[PDB]
Each structure stands twice: as C-alpha cells, then as structure tokens.
Amino acid sequence: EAEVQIDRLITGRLQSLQTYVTQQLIRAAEIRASANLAATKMSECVLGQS
C-alpha cells in the first residue's frame, strides 16, 4: 500500500508542476511581445526621427 500512497502523492505534485509550467509559458510570451515593441521603439526613435 506504500505504492498506492506514493501514486497519490506523485499525481498531485505532477499536476501542480504542469500548471506552473503553463502559466510560465504564457507570461514569457507576453514579455516577448513587450520586448519586441521596446526594440522597435528604440531602433526607430533613437537612431532617427519619428
């Protein structure tokens, strides 16, 4: 029955880990979009005139 208990614990922890990974992916995508906007602004307004 140790195996039953270990199965319960493993499935719970794995589910929590997967949720965290997905949220991190979403946040990283948003940060990438913001970084692209910042790069465009820096390249266009600093090195020239808008």
Binding site: S43, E44, L47, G48, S50
Partner: protein, 49 residues
Amino acid sequence: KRVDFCGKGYHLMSFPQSAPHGVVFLHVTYVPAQEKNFTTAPAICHDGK
C-alpha cells in the same frame, strides 16, 4: 521611411521569394562611404543681412 525596418541603411526596393513554409525578402539598400572633413558654417553675412 522608418529606419532599420527593412535592411540596414537607406531603403530603395525589395523582392519577395517563396519557401517551403515561409517567405524570403531580398532588400536593396544604399550606403555611403569615402568621407572627407571640410570646414562648415551656419550662415553667411553680407551687407548686414
């Protein structure tokens, strides 16, 4: 007219080409060279004007 959007330098024109899962742009750009020094000035006075 926006700088560095297409190529590096002043922009003239472009050509597209296809790819298996995308597009490929060929940009034609214009770049100066062979500079000098000279001496400048902001304005020239003559007859007081």
